[PDB]
Amino acid sequence: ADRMSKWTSKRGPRSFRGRKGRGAKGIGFLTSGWRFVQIKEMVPEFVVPDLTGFKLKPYVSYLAPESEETPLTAAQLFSEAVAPAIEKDFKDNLEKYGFEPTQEGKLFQLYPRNFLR
Amino acid sequence: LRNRVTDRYFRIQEVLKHARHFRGRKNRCYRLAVRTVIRAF
Amino acid sequence: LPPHYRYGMSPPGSVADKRKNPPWIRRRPVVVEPISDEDWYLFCGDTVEILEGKDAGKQGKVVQVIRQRNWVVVGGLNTHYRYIGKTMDYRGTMIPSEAPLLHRQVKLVDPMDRKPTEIEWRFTEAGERVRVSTRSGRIIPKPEWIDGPKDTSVEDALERTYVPCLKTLQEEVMEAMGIKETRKYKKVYWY
Amino acid sequence: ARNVVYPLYRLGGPQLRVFRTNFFIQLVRPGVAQPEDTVQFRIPMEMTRVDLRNYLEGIYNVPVAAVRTRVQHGSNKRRDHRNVRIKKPDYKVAYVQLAHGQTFTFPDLFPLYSMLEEERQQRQSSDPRRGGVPSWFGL
Amino acid sequence: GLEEFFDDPKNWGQEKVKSGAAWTCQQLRNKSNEDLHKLWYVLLKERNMLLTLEQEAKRQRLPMPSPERLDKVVDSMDALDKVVQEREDALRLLQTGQERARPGAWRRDIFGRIIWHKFKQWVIPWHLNKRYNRKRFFALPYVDHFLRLEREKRARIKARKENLERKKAKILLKKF
Amino acid sequence: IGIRLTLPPPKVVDRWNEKRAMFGVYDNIGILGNFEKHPKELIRGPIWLRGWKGNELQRCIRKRKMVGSRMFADDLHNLNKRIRYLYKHFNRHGKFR
Amino acid sequence: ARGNEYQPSNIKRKNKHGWVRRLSTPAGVQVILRRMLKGRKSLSH
């Protein structure tokens, strides 16, 4: 009779309560006998770096110069990365300069994005 | 409510002034006071 | 904030503000003339002169500016007196409390003439935008740390380690940390 | 990670890796008596116990022996001035049992005015003998 | 260790804890991808510690020491995420020309509203997916009347807003 | 108690604002301007009653005829129902017949 | 004897007045459209 309350797994009979989740991403599958096979490759592996020696504390000193915000753009990235090599080889096959015709074949495809975060 | 009556206080008082000396609610309530005042006149 | 929220002397989020303007109030909105941000000329710390009311003529320093209601609070001026700490037994102590003043009731003061002045926002080649007094000229100036254990040093903060490249953070970190992955991502269907 | 589309895994595919973790957890004081090796956390609802184990073992190097989770329902009984129910958010609670016999106990966190105090000290409460007569006058 | 979930023991109990400024987007834009990756986890540990402090403060019914550093940390993490997303978007635009990372399409739903359907990941093609075929992306003629009614409702709301704004402006002009 | 206990705020009327001062000007545009423009052309308002007058039924009929296609759905339904009701009232009810 | 006609059961609730059932037939789609036009916070049950 309650329509304004969110539908959750805590509401409903045993089947409903078991079937509905809470948003957690799946980790594996279910085989015969309701046995859960957990796939390791489906488990997010936190790639935590080595913070030893890192010099960037979470906060920045207030005695720091203020600079104008310059949102990075595709043109800016091209100028700072590709343009030097393009100019050098023009004075002196875009794959050599860096262009990748297709994202397919890569571990981290830019579109459709196939990596987390 | 384009046009509304704003004098109803005085319209009621014109009758109640002649009923102030009655007995019971006839001296306070217009619905009764008007009848009693008409009879008195 | 609730619609037509009545800005008061207390900040818009204090306990006193919540007490005076609980969520259910529907008081009549206060009519305030629409002074644009490019026309506002009173700023915190500016020396001003009171034109009307008690203490008219006296010059003080703007302490607070409630811009949402065209207010400037002159420190120690336009003061009534109120009790603070008054408990069931103690009478409390008398304190001078300032009342807000409208910018139409308050005028700025020349830096040296020490007299009320009408102001104009005239562009100057050096000071692109700055105040200029009209009756007597002259520009009224706009008035106004040890690193902790968890604060970056300035040199580290300003160090430019970014070498622009055509690599995502993911693969760049993979190369840096030595993680090696040979499995190829099988193509999926999007729809 | 949360609020992000997980790349779909097909058999033989590469390992799923997250580089900038979006999960933030809180270490909370248990409300009831717990074993010396148990640590209580409040967790995002989208985080599994395996995810929490890897999170703690990678970001904090905490040897985790076991993990259990429970979704605590937040009260929806409270109502505002408009008679509309105010929902306290539901949240996930994780109990983590440390390994190698390690023990954890919640640390004991949390172990003008001058003028007001001076005047209160200088109250000079009214003398009953005065019978309400003001005291300022010296006659 | 679990001690990283709590502030410094000396700082425990201090009424106020001094902290620097939140990382700015411009400052972060100069840092390498690895440096941003490490700073993300530094800020993550700080955020976990600050959330722990907040929850313990609520439990003890005491104010949280220096509540502004939690906002500073959140702002720093948001700025770092924005920088990383900007770099990824620039690279994606350069290499593919797509402004969105997730495939999607403009489609008319069963209710006749034009929506941006975000494609999901499937192992089988759409013509074989049973659930997707059940999902309908076309509005039958009976929805046209309701589309018109909704359009007119929106028009009425907008007209009321504009007329009220003009009335208020006239009253303000008369008053001043 | 239906009477206010305070005098209403004073109402000041500017008898010499532009509108009042220039009211009535060009009402004789026709007779004084070689009849190039009819005075009814000075009426600004709804398109279906510019220089035209009638009872409620006539006004509703004219509104539906002239702007009915551009009316909103529910407004047009209301106008049709009002026309129906007014037809019945004027053609079937009344003291005189 | 009467008055307790509502014997609650979430299965029946969702199978009778649910989003899927309402969208199953054109009439239910128009029911949902009417709720949306009226501004109901709960389009389905």
Add this chain to the structure above:
Amino acid sequence: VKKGFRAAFRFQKELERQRLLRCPPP
């Protein structure tokens, strides 16, 4: 609030009369 001024003015005069009667002037 009912728009109008004359009824309010009459009521104000009557209130003045009642006030004078209740508190006669010296």
Add this chain to the structure above:
Amino acid sequence: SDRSIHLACTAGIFDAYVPPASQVSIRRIKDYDANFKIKDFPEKAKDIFIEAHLCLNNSDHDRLHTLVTEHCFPDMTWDIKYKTVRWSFVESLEPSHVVQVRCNVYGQITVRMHTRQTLAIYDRFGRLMYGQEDVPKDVLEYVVFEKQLPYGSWRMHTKIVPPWAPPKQPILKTVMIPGPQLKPEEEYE
């Protein structure tokens, strides 16, 4: 809170003139004002005192706020609210003279005044409850004035009462002082 309470006085007297060397304080006063006169102060202090007490008599709180400090106004008005005070200065026996002076910066001057005044305090109902309307009484007092150093001025801050002060005039009405309101379990000692 960017804005703070702008006090116009201090909690209490800096150094108390214990009744029966300060030229540095006088120097500070003069370097702040440049027209002050210790020799001329006593007459001004007496005028301020008389005017403030007449303001009390006439219930002139606006003028009291100018003639006395915020640490004085409550002390003067709190207990006299709802009652009428008929105060009148008749003469000054010995001339008023400065005694002690000490000093965002305030300057306090203690002035000893041995004058003669009158009191007649009535109730809400106009019933005399203290003093006589005509009989004059000799009062020795030590009025500490204070000033705030742009638009500040000299205002009464406090009145130091000597510990050896003669007992004040007796009250007209008799008083009852309740003893320990013992609970049943308690016993009187």
Add this chain to the structure above:
RNA sequence: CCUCCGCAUAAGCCUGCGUCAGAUACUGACAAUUAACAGCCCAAUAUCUACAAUCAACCAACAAGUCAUUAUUACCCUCACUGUCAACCCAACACAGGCAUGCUCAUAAGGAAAGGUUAAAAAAAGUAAAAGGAACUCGGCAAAUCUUACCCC
């Protein structure tokens, strides 16, 4: 003194007498229910599957009945997610009503019919009654007993 009950599961509800602090089983804050129980399953293509249950043994049947695989090919390298509270649900209510199942068959569990007084009439429930025993009444209704012989449908 009562015990209709009670304790659990199902279904339903969704924090709804846990702690602290405030008011005038209410309000605000804090905490909580931890999977082994239960839900959430099954790689294909063909191919098997006459002989109830009832202590299944006699017998007894008619209403003819819940329970079964093989052949080949793929296939292990991995224990997630969700319910877990309560004095509770449907009846506008702290409603004498309705509410499936397992154990307890009077309980080890769960509860209180009397706010205080007096002991008027009328009213309700109950107990007892001299002699009589349906004379009551439309009718043995009710109550008390355990009581024959008929007729109509």
Add this chain to the structure above:
RNA sequence: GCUACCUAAGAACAGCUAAAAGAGCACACCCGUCUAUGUAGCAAAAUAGUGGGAAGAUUUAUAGGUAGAGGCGACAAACCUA
């Protein structure tokens, strides 16, 4: 989600007499013959006693179906959310 009927797969029916029973007495359970109370009631049909059935054409939990020029009905013009 009540109720009329039906579909799927379930559950309950003590004890005694008799013996394979639309059998008898009689619990739980279902129903509601008669009386009293109640009639803005505990209840928009209840309570107490009494009573009929209570191994069957029984009762009942769960999910599904038949929708009004209709359904369903061991026809009472019954019931289909008071």
Add this chain to the structure above:
RNA sequence: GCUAAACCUAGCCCCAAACCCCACCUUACUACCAGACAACCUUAGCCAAACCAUUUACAUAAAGUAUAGGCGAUAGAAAUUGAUGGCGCAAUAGAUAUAGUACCGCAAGGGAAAGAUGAAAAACCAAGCAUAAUAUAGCAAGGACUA
């Protein structure tokens, strides 16, 4: 003197002009498996005809004309002609709207009420009663009366 009384603006009405991250069809708001199932089809009736049965409306001018019509209630052309806000409301009003919320219903669906200080809060009047219960007799008043 208590209940209370008032209040001005929240907004609304009519016109003109102008065209307007993630999740979610399975039990919606649920990351992740062989689909196939896909929409067009005269409105009717109330009501009028005093019943009802054919029938009954959904720029100006020609014109309520030609025509139609149980030739009756009524229906009804065309040729042709030329085509900048408020004597609005102001909280029982104006939108239902503080809100399609609360609440009610299984569902479709129905659907509310209300607020008022001040520059700054970091400063006398409805009913009903009470003051103050009541004196023989009576539509409770009138003529009166010193009363």
